Design a protein around this ligand. Structure first.
Ligand SMILES: OC[C@H]1O[C@H](O[C@H]2[C@H](O)[C@@H](O)[C@@H](O)O[C@@H]2CO)[C@H](O)[C@@H](O)[C@@H]1O
Ligand SMILES: [Ca+2]
Ligand SMILES: [Ca+2]
Ligand SMILES: [Ca+2]
Ligand SMILES: [Ca+2]
Length: 452
């Protein structure tokens, strides 16, 4: 049976992905980094086979609801019940969904309950005076009240305490599910909205579709803070603690992988569903992983191979930001949202393809436990077991050839067959000598000894 633990998510910012219809390019200026660039829903449909062939099983779209002027990213909503006209029509969205489901892919929409756009009509409506919290900045971030009540970046902060507001938000959450048959929501700005609302919200959306999937964006690096939202009806959480370590570690050579293993232990300790954590190297709110490599004056492709191998072999739900597969450069927002280029070399596309194939094929990578066998200054060995399958993941994030001998940590008398790069390690006198050249990786399955 397919569960969310088994999924791999491709993450698309609609306006910056693929312009499949030039006729809806109304305010487009591709030479203005703050304008619409013209990517749309037709462009997504056009690339569903591309996405599926890399092995992704689900797409998360940035919000598609009608935005005010300048809202190319979707987060400045003007009408919760309408598709943004740059992106297409409702009919186009239903067809995207249908086309995704025909290829056995799930669709998650980015969903906003915390705020409206700066210029939403409700702000000039006296009958909606009490739909918004008092207009003030958040200054004390350690006061969770203030975090929940204040206007984030000056965004009008909806007052969920008002039952009219709460009801409008529940109804529109249900409406999209009923109308379009989407598979889940990625919930924006979760920590800015009180926990009691999340419990009710989850009950409401699952009343329409019992298996509806919620993925919460809780922007924080302390997994104790993040984990609490798991207890209020949100199935899965975005793993910022993972990202903080993975982005750093993999964007330069000779750096220890051990912090990632501590992320995992802490995940098991704090979260009720520690495999339902969204893993990533970068996203729409971060400097591009490629750019971190470039800052380090080091080849981004080799960095990406190492980081992606970890992402696709460690616990959680990998989430790959569009463009990762082409080492798309970019600095801080908005430069980390460049239009996708489909006319590049295929080296990383093919690599991702193999990683997604292996994670599909090896249940230990989706469901196994996760042990650390060895880690030294960037040379790492991990082991994963599920029922009768044992895999070993070897990542040499060092600048030299490394030989690491296991002696006891695996059952004697077998061989490790390298499924990513064809390596072969045979038990010799009960020991396995794993040799990796600098900056390479391998994923082995343990299996019986073969021979000529
Ligand atoms: O105008 C503020 C800001 O809004 C958006 O930031 C998003 C961010 O992208 C999301 O992942 C999430 O945390 O919520 C924020 C607002 O809903 C835009 O993406 C950003 O460019 C813009 O500056
Ligand atoms: Ca367009
Ligand atoms: Ca608009
Ligand atoms: Ca709020
Ligand atoms: Ca060590």
């Amino acid at each position: 049976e397919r569960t969310w633990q088994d999924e791999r998510i491709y993450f698309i910012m609609v306006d910056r992905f693929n312009n499949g219809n030039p006729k809806n390019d109304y305010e487009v200026d591709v030479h203005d980094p703050k304008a619409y660039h013209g990517g749309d829903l037709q462009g997504i449909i056009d690339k569903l086979d591309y996405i599926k062939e890399m092995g992704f099983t689900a797409i998360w779209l940035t919000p598609i609801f009608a935005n005010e002027k300048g809202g190319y990213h979707g987060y400045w909503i003007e009408d919760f019940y309408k598709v943004e006209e740059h992106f297409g029509t409702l009919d186009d969205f239903k067809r995207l969904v249908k086309e995704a489901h025909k290829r056995d892919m799930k669709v998650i929409l980015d969903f906003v309950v915390n705020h409206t756009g700066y210029n939403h009509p409700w702000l000039n409506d006296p009958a909606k005076k009490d739909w918004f919290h008092e207009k003030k900045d958040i200054f004390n971030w350690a006061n969770q009240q203030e975090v929940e009540n204040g206007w984030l970046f000056g965004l009008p902060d909806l007052a969920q305490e008002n039952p009219e507001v709460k009801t409008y938000l529940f109804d529109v959450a249900k409406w999209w599910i009923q109308e379009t048959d989407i598979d889940g929501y990625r919930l924006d700005t979760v920590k800015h909205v009180p926990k009691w609302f999340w419990d009710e919200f989850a009950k409401e959306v699952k009343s329409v579709k019992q298996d509806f999937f919620l993925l919460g964006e809780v922007w924080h690096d302390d997994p104790r803070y993040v984990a609490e939202y798991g207890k209020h009806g949100i199935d899965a959480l975005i793993d910022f603690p993972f990202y903080k370590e993975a982005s750093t570690i993999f964007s330069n050579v000779d750096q220890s992988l051990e912090p990632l293993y501590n992320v995992w232990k802490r995940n098991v300790a704090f979260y009720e569903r520690p495999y339902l954590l969204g893993t990533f190297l970068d996203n729409h709110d971060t400097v591009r992983f490629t750019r971190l490599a470039l800052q380090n004056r080091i080849n981004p492709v080799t960095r990406l191979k190492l980081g992606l191998t970890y992402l696709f072999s460690a616990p959680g739900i990998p989430i790959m930001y569009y463009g990762t597969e082409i080492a798309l450069d970019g600095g801080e927002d908005p430069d980390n949202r460049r239009l996708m280029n489909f006319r590049t070399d295929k080296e990383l596309i093919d690599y991702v393809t193999k990683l997604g194939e292996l994670r599909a094929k090896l249940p230990s990578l989706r469901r196994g436990d996760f042990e650390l066998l060895y880690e030294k200054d960037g040379m790492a060995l991990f082991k994963r077991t599920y029922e009768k399958e044992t895999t070993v993941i070897a990542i040499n994030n060092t600048s030299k050839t490394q030989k690491v001998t296991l002696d006891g940590e695996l059952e004697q008398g077998k061989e490790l067959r390298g499924l990513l790069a064809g390596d072969l390690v045979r038990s010799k006198d009960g020991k396995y000598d794993i040799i990796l050249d600098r900056e390479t990786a391998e994923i082995y399955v343990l299996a019986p000894k073969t021979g000529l």
